[PDB]
Enzyme design. Structure first.
Site, mmCIF file in Angstrom:
data_model
loop_
_atom_site.group_PDB
_atom_site.id
_atom_site.type_symbol
_atom_site.label_atom_id
_atom_site.label_comp_id
_atom_site.label_asym_id
_atom_site.label_seq_id
_atom_site.Cartn_x
_atom_site.Cartn_y
_atom_site.Cartn_z
ATOM 1 N N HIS D 161 0.824 -1.198 0.000
ATOM 2 C CA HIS D 161 0.000 0.000 0.000
ATOM 3 C C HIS D 161 0.862 1.253 0.000
ATOM 4 C CE1 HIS D 161 -3.329 -2.753 1.104
ATOM 5 N NE2 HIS D 161 -3.983 -1.899 0.339
ATOM 6 N N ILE D 162 1.847 1.318 0.915
ATOM 7 C CA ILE D 162 2.748 2.471 1.020
ATOM 8 C C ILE D 162 3.720 2.549 -0.158
ATOM 9 C CG2 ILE D 162 4.612 3.470 2.366
ATOM 10 C CD1 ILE D 162 3.277 2.130 4.899
ATOM 11 N N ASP D 181 10.421 -6.817 -4.643
ATOM 12 C CA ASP D 181 9.359 -7.386 -3.830
ATOM 13 C C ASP D 181 9.424 -8.885 -4.036
ATOM 14 O OD1 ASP D 181 6.809 -8.221 -2.633
ATOM 15 O OD2 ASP D 181 6.129 -6.161 -2.774
ATOM 16 N N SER D 239 9.238 1.650 8.203
ATOM 17 C CA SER D 239 8.414 0.443 8.171
ATOM 18 C C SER D 239 8.290 -0.187 9.548
ATOM 19 C CB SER D 239 8.996 -0.575 7.186
ATOM 20 O OG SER D 239 10.407 -0.683 7.337
ATOM 21 N N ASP D 264 12.207 6.387 11.156
ATOM 22 C CA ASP D 264 10.995 6.619 11.920
ATOM 23 C C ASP D 264 10.680 5.510 12.904
ATOM 24 O OD1 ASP D 264 8.744 8.342 12.413
ATOM 25 O OD2 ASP D 264 7.472 6.784 11.494
ATOM 26 N N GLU D 269 11.207 1.120 20.963
ATOM 27 C CA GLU D 269 10.481 2.381 21.033
ATOM 28 C C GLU D 269 9.780 2.461 22.394
ATOM 29 O OE1 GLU D 269 7.715 2.155 17.778
ATOM 30 O OE2 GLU D 269 9.274 2.096 16.245
ATOM 31 N N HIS D 300 8.264 7.522 15.321
ATOM 32 C CA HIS D 300 7.207 6.630 14.834
ATOM 33 C C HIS D 300 5.943 7.412 14.479
ATOM 34 C CE1 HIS D 300 5.371 2.848 14.015
ATOM 35 N NE2 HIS D 300 4.427 3.025 14.922
ATOM 36 N N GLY D 302 5.210 8.287 11.150
ATOM 37 C CA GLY D 302 4.886 8.182 9.739
ATOM 38 C C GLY D 302 3.415 8.075 9.410
ATOM 39 N N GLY D 303 2.557 8.260 10.385
ATOM 40 C CA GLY D 303 1.157 8.095 10.085
ATOM 41 C C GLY D 303 0.342 8.900 11.054
HETATM 42 N N1 LIG Z 1 5.962 4.652 9.993
HETATM 43 C C1 LIG Z 1 4.776 4.339 10.489
HETATM 44 O O1 LIG Z 1 4.310 4.882 11.501
HETATM 45 C C2 LIG Z 1 3.972 3.304 9.760
HETATM 46 C C3 LIG Z 1 2.608 3.504 9.524
HETATM 47 C C4 LIG Z 1 1.889 2.572 8.802
HETATM 48 C C5 LIG Z 1 2.520 1.466 8.329
HETATM 49 N N2 LIG Z 1 3.848 1.243 8.575
HETATM 50 C C6 LIG Z 1 4.434 -0.053 8.191
HETATM 51 O O2 LIG Z 1 4.812 -0.019 6.845
HETATM 52 C C7 LIG Z 1 4.799 -1.363 6.298
HETATM 53 C C8 LIG Z 1 4.150 -1.386 4.936
HETATM 54 O O3 LIG Z 1 2.744 -1.099 5.067
HETATM 55 P P1 LIG Z 1 1.781 -1.414 3.837
HETATM 56 O O4 LIG Z 1 0.458 -0.813 4.135
HETATM 57 O O5 LIG Z 1 2.455 -1.064 2.562
HETATM 58 O O6 LIG Z 1 1.738 -3.008 3.893
HETATM 59 P P2 LIG Z 1 1.531 -3.989 2.664
HETATM 60 O O7 LIG Z 1 1.196 -5.302 3.243
HETATM 61 O O8 LIG Z 1 0.534 -3.322 1.719
HETATM 62 O O9 LIG Z 1 2.882 -3.946 1.777
HETATM 63 C C9 LIG Z 1 4.021 -4.693 2.215
HETATM 64 C C10 LIG Z 1 4.726 -5.138 0.963
HETATM 65 O O10 LIG Z 1 6.003 -5.723 1.294
HETATM 66 C C11 LIG Z 1 6.194 -6.864 0.489
HETATM 67 N N3 LIG Z 1 7.146 -7.714 1.197
HETATM 68 C C12 LIG Z 1 6.896 -8.443 2.330
HETATM 69 N N4 LIG Z 1 7.964 -8.986 2.856
HETATM 70 C C13 LIG Z 1 8.995 -8.603 2.000
HETATM 71 C C14 LIG Z 1 10.375 -8.848 2.008
HETATM 72 N N5 LIG Z 1 10.999 -9.601 2.921
HETATM 73 N N6 LIG Z 1 11.113 -8.305 1.013
HETATM 74 C C15 LIG Z 1 10.492 -7.587 0.071
HETATM 75 N N7 LIG Z 1 9.194 -7.299 -0.045
HETATM 76 C C16 LIG Z 1 8.485 -7.829 0.965
HETATM 77 C C17 LIG Z 1 4.799 -7.446 0.334
HETATM 78 O O11 LIG Z 1 4.739 -8.277 -0.816
HETATM 79 C C18 LIG Z 1 3.977 -6.170 0.128
HETATM 80 O O12 LIG Z 1 4.078 -5.724 -1.219
HETATM 81 C C19 LIG Z 1 4.115 -2.237 7.359
HETATM 82 O O13 LIG Z 1 5.108 -3.008 8.028
HETATM 83 C C20 LIG Z 1 3.432 -1.206 8.272
HETATM 84 O O14 LIG Z 1 3.336 -1.624 9.628
HETATM 85 C C21 LIG Z 1 4.539 2.167 9.277
#
Ligand SMILES: NC(=O)c1ccc[n+]([C@@H]2O[C@H](COP(=O)([O-])OP(=O)(O)OC[C@H]3O[C@@H](n4cnc5c(N)ncnc54)[C@H](O)[C@@H]3O)[C@@H](O)[C@H]2O)c1
Ligand SMILES: NC(=O)c1ccc[n+]([C@@H]2O[C@H](COP(=O)([O-])OP(=O)(O)OC[C@H]3O[C@@H](n4cnc5c(N)ncnc54)[C@H](O)[C@@H]3O)[C@@H](O)[C@H]2O)c1
Ligand SMILES: NC(=O)c1ccc[n+]([C@@H]2O[C@H](COP(=O)([O-])OP(=O)(O)OC[C@H]3O[C@@H](n4cnc5c(N)ncnc54)[C@H](O)[C@@H]3O)[C@@H](O)[C@H]2O)c1
Ligand SMILES: NC(=O)c1ccc[n+]([C@@H]2O[C@H](COP(=O)([O-])OP(=O)(O)OC[C@H]3O[C@@H](n4cnc5c(N)ncnc54)[C@H](O)[C@@H]3O)[C@@H](O)[C@H]2O)c1
Ligand SMILES: O=P([O-])([O-])O
Ligand SMILES: O=P([O-])([O-])O
Ligand SMILES: O=P([O-])([O-])O
Ligand SMILES: O=P([O-])([O-])O
Lengths: 419, 421, 422, 422
Positions: D161-162, D181, D239, D264, D269, D300, D302-303
């Site tokens: 998603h991100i 990926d 992440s 972040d 934490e 932390h 990022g959201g």
């Molecule tokens: N900074 C923040 O405060 C904050 C806020 C929201 C989300 N996040 C984190 O960001 C991350 C991504 O969120 P998202 O909504 O995109 O999730 P998501 O599930 O949509 O996307 C994750 C992607 O990573 C890929 N992937 C998984 N393991 C992998 C690996 N070992 N190597 C390569 N690719 C791999 C998956 O195929 C998928 O495309 C999550 O871990 C989420 O917790 C952080």
């Protein structure tokens, strides 16, 4: 990840389906009998008895007479848009699911209209006939650049939307009138009245389905309700345009040109003289009229289109033959399950097609009371109904008993267990 | 305080062979007496009407030669509302100090849209199928009928039409490759090719957008066709010599090229006729018409209302800018000279438009005459035997302008002189 | 096309010195055309400066050029300010002595826009203050008054080079663009030009300034204007250090009327980098300024990127080479903008005259008399004040004739400089 | 034609406990509910008193809801975590009492994506250091190794998603996008999926992480991998606090191999905001890290934007409203995902049964016998663990008959929660 069933059935394909249907079936592991032409009632009935899935096209005629004899059939896949060449009500009664691909000609119809919009604006069609017969008439009056004119899309559906972005890319202004308020794509504008679209538009396209509200939607009164020098294109259904009124309007120089892909009476076979006055009394008058592009229902006749329609419907039948998934059937309930993406072994799937009468689920779940039912989903599409259930620990000794008990019930139409 | 009266009807402009109305708007809003004719005039009526005209706007039909321009005095400029300077005796016009203008790039979108339409017609074979239903035959065929999306278009000439074709074609979902003798900064998602042969190998549609040159004549011949993908398409709306028509009819009949579309031919007729496009013009005419998927057009690339309207706007503004500010950039037969309009803040600044014979010592002659006033700017250039000088001289007196004009008009090797004030 | 070959042979030797660390691309352009280049990494003192200059100068706004240090400089042709502004360099005198000055003012257009885009996101999400906090061990995860950039409206003041480029970037990020400019400028993309500045301030969440320094723009954003923009909006100034009334802004930020601000220019900037330069001795408010939440302070780094400097090198070196080799002077600051076509290898025995004079009547009578022996194919002269510049292309000339022509021309009254191409 | 009509009371009762966005109140009020809002998280005592009749409770990341504090809740239906994570829910208990739990895990996509674009631009230009410097009075205007983001290439690890949202924005700013990926994913815009992570690291100027926490991602970027990057490139991790080998990174930056990085998320934490939480006690490397130049640290966040909490509100309120009104439980964390068509009001004699039971054989025998008097038009049952959820639409029913149907279903064995909707 996902388990299959038995997997050794037999399918008969009748009117030249793309080889992509063949790849999906053969890579799935089935027996496939391919035929290049449409077969007669006799040879078909003999060949359908031990057939499992038939893939037909618009020509092959499937009726209760020829479908009574087919007792080993599961689902019928129309590699078509249209469904009326198959007796849906009976097939539902005998528990046969019918599938089709109704939106596969979308990009193929959009590109056709775009080309017809440009050709009519430049009269490219007339010019090619003229040079073919030796005449050279270079006139620039009433020849337009497409950029800067406005396109009126009637019916902003699957074809309507794809056309709308393309016309924007070409530099046309897009207006669409639709019974439903639909989120416009790109820079288009939803109109309140049909009159506003017709009044403000330079080009008018029809992309609506056939309903009495759409029948003769544009007739002689509707034609005059429009721009001084304009063009009309209809590639939906042969009844939306009043063709006698239209030939009257075109001869009076009210509509600058038009392109038609569909007619009220199209012939069923290709011929050297098929498109004659015998099917349509006006055919000679139209042919003697200027700047009209006439086409034989080719809006969806492309290589890329047929490959996409083939893959889609073959994948649909494959998923229905192998899993119970019936989503997209025309005459059937739309039912589906997780198809065992995490489930372990020794799990059976019950596919019970029944008549929709109360208590059927009582009898069945009683028959199943012996084992745990992990998931169940049943829905009813009229007089027929469809139940799917996943039971968790069955042995070949038990599966036999479960089938006959289900077979002895009232209102069983079709029973299958997937292993 | 000084201040000068309006002269209406002072200029008289003549527009022939039906020039677009945008030209009349541009001229009238400036204020001219404009004699419009929808047709080309006869030799007698022209010479009668041309003697005291001040600007003539013609098209490719009207023939202006030494005979008809000899009598024409008080003429300033000729506007070809054309692409080509067809039938204008430029060398004579220059000789008498007459500037000729045209608008060569006004048909760009009109030719691009045509190509886009023809690509679609060939891919869907709409032309042959629409002829079939018109003649009563019904053949609904989908084999080798393609959607344009995902195919690649090979553009041969990446100029005005080529680039415009490129962005449109990518918008339609085509991959665009272009081969050009010049390296051109690609627009959008286009790809510059190294050799022409790579383009031919990789392309599903190939269009020609080159000028007529010895290098381009029969540019696509039989070797080139065989170097194209089995069952590809060819479009030529550039010049009637660029494609080897016999070579092509051989290749299409051999099912190596699926179809093609042509707007220009080696021998096009000079007048419209009811049976003009016959075999007498081109020995292959019968063989060509016989092929199955060929879209033929009568040199209609760019014959659109919008194309003509732009030509009117471009050429009419150009002539108007030459009459009012002496600006000649873009003339076909003339030196290209131009200077900053003027700022209006400083008064009594005159501008000299001195067209002369390109002979040494003339600039000595003029700058001596102008030695009495300060020359803020000056620019003179030579295009042939003729040359053009524009200068802005500072703090001139109305009594002096007449003298400066009289001195200048009496000079040797002056062909025409004009003073603005 | 054409060969466009032509090589300048009057004296036959020239030596140009590019100092204050001009980008290496400037060195390649000069050397590849074939010159002697004396390179320096710093700005020189008056004494060492005056020496070595007798036998083209490239400065960087740091080097101080006045009439005094240029009087002694003979055999000078052109001065290349690898700068935006040509300030504290005596343009009027250099003109008086016929010295052309060049610069590159629009090469920092992309660098300043990207900055503002960067500064918009960080002010909205308060990235700066949050990073200071974690550096000293404090952890305050707050989401109040931290916004997504998408959906907000960006007020661009001045729709010029930066204003334009900034606008497409702001939209691509999902911002609505509103811009106020004294001239009606055809909006790029979906932007809207506003009628009154007060309108722009009223509806905008981010306001950036990208206008030049004029009396009309000095302190143009003062206490009334800040009071006009929306409660909690943000102010960004990376144009010129006089455009924002810092006292007014600092008042507003303390009053929690303005959520943050980012400043890249100040009224009084240091002339050298230093460890304690940014003090109240430089600017009276500096202490109060720093004591404020969510303020991004930067030391005139708007144009400070590697790409900008490389672009500045290519542009100004190309301009000097063109002025040296073909004479094309368009873009000079204190000089008439004059240029003629290439010339050609095909046209042999064709000389080009570059004659700079005092803007007084009769010079062309004198000059064109001198040239009467040969045919002038093209000639162009324009005047930028008391000085004027003439370019001429002469046909059928021989080195025997060339000497006389230079001798005659060098002898003219009120002639300031003569040059020949061959 | 009988058309029996019910009474309206204040019975409908919803409880929002700690820091909910204003959009939940609008969604709940416009739906017609009684909503008790609280700004803080309450103690066990005040909580138990307030939850007894609450139809629906909404907690946040702070509020502790456990089986003990949930024992008292009788008229409770669903617990909505206005969170990404459901850490403080105690799901098994909610299931035992047949309570569905909801959340919104993907709301922070544009907020975290925008942070990255800002942090890329900030690192490229060293904005943090420059702004710290001016605040501390030093003035260091440097352009060396400061870059325009346009023309550099961004390497995305994780295109979910991100990662997807980030790719489009990065392209808008003029970057080349590469992504690695584990799953082959259809590239958006002009991006290219690269085969190996090593390929990605070698060709890239900027590296971002957007993967979930897996043993494969734990210390995913370590010292061998950092050395596999362009000499003097940048690192971004927003992440999971486990994806980066922090000591390996501190080694590379001190070795001038990595020009900067922005973080972040971290291994350790704090669970509460504090003035000294982030000390060497929390992370052994903290002192060495903070002493390094050009590093952007964030807590932390990022959201943590207004837009994010607003989107979270709309999403979870919409989900709870669908479970309360239609039974659609899709998206529940602890529940089976069950749903049926919306039920066109035109057929006015059809009841909807929401029968939650224990996942044991014979239940559907028992139930469909009870419902055997009328036709079941649609039926759908699914099982999550030991609990199961049934939805059924039974036809032509009269208000007189409904009492029996509810009574029998409420009387069944191993029935945990029963509800009839018409
Ligand atoms: N900074 C923040 O405060 C904050 C806020 C929201 C989300 N996040 C984190 O960001 C991350 C991504 O969120 P998202 O909504 O995109 O999730 P998501 O599930 O949509 O996307 C994750 C992607 O990573 C890929 N992937 C998984 N393991 C992998 C690996 N070992 N190597 C390569 N690719 C791999 C998956 O195929 C998928 O495309 C999550 O871990 C989420 O917790 C952080
Ligand atoms: N020429 C061909 O060979 C060819 C190929 C494919 C489809 N079609 C026909 O094209 C039509 C459109 O196909 P589709 O996939 O776009 O279907 P669609 O159902 O996606 O879109 C039809 C749209 O028309 C709208 N509509 C219906 N009646 C209307 C009316 N009276 N006025 C205005 N809007 C109205 C509906 O709201 C809908 O959005 C169908 O009739 C289909 O059979 C023809
Ligand atoms: N069909 C019509 O009625 C119609 C209307 C207008 C223009 N045209 C013709 O179309 C042609 C193109 O017009 P334009 O405006 O693009 O001209 P242009 O000058 O803008 O472009 C011509 C391009 O062809 C390239 N080129 C030259 N020789 C080449 C070669 N051997 N192979 C490949 N590329 C080569 C040039 O580099 C240039 O980029 C002209 O011949 C023009 O007269 C036809
Ligand atoms: N921070 C830095 O290091 C840095 C780098 C480069 C440029 N700049 C400065 O940024 C400014 C903008 O640069 P540019 O290249 O875009 O200049 P520009 O000349 O291209 O654009 C300035 C625009 O401002 C408009 N304008 C003038 N006065 C105005 C007023 N009172 N109110 C509103 N609009 C007004 C003008 O009409 C013009 O369109 C310049 O002053 C430049 O020196 C700063
Ligand atoms: O004329 P001038 O001498 O340049 O003033
Ligand atoms: O006098 P000139 O040289 O001919 O212009
Ligand atoms: O089978 P069941 O009863 O649902 O568990
Ligand atoms: O049993 P049912 O209800 O018919 O499904």
């Amino acid at each position: 990840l996902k388990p299959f069933s038995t997997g050794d059935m037999n399918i008969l394909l009748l009117e030249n389906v793309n080889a992509t249907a063949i790849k999906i079936f053969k890579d799935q592991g089935y027996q496939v009998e391919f035929h290049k032409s449409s077969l007669p009632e006799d040879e078909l009935i003999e060949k359908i008895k031990d057939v499992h899935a038939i893939g037909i096209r618009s020509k092959t005629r499937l009726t209760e007479k020829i479908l009574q004899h087919a007792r080993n059939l599961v689902c019928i896949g129309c590699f078509c848009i249209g469904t009326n060449q198959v007796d849906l009500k009976y097939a539902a009664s005998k528990g046969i699911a019918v599938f089709n691909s109704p939106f596969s000609n979308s990009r193929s119809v959009a590109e056709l209209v775009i080309g017809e919009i440009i050709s009519l604006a430049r009269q490219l069609g007339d010019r090619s006939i003229e040079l073919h017969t030796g005449t050279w008439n270079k006139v620039a009056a009433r020849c337009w650049e497409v950029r800067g004119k406005t396109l009126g899309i009637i019916g902003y559906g699957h074809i309507g939307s794809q056309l709308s972005v393309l016309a924007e890319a070409m530099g046309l202004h897009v207006l669409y009138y639709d019974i439903v308020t639909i989120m416009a794509l790109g820079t288009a504008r939803q109109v309140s009245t049909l009159d506003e679209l017709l009044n403000k538009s330079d080009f008018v396209t029809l992309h609506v389905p056939a309903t009495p509200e759409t029948e003769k939607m544009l007739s002689a009164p509707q034609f005059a309700a429009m721009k001084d020098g304009a063009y009309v294109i209809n590639a939906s259904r042969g009844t939306v345009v009043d063709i006698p009124s239209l030939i009257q309007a075109v001869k009076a120089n009210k509509i600058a040109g038009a392109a038609l892909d569909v007619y009220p009476h199209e012939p069923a076979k290709n011929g050297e003289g098929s498109f004659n006055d015998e099917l349509n009394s006006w055919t000679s008058e139209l042919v003697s009229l200027p700047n009209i592009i006439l086409t034989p229902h080719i809006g969806g006749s492309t290589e890329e289109a047929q490959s996409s329609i083939g893959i889609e419907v073959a994948t649909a039948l494959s998923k229905y033959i192998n899993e119970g998934n019936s989503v997209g059937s025309v005459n059937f309930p739309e039912v589906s399950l997780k198809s065992l993406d995490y489930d372990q072994e020794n799990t059976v799937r019950v596919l019970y097609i029944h008549r929709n009468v109360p208590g059927v689920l009582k009898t069945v779940n009683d028959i199943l009371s012996d084992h745990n039912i992990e998931k169940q989903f049943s829905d009813s599409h009229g007089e027929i109904a469809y139940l799917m259930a996943d039971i968790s620990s069955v042995n070949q000794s038990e599966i036999k008993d479960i089938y006959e008990k289900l077979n002895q019930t009232s209102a069983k139409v079709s029973i299958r267990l997937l292993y």
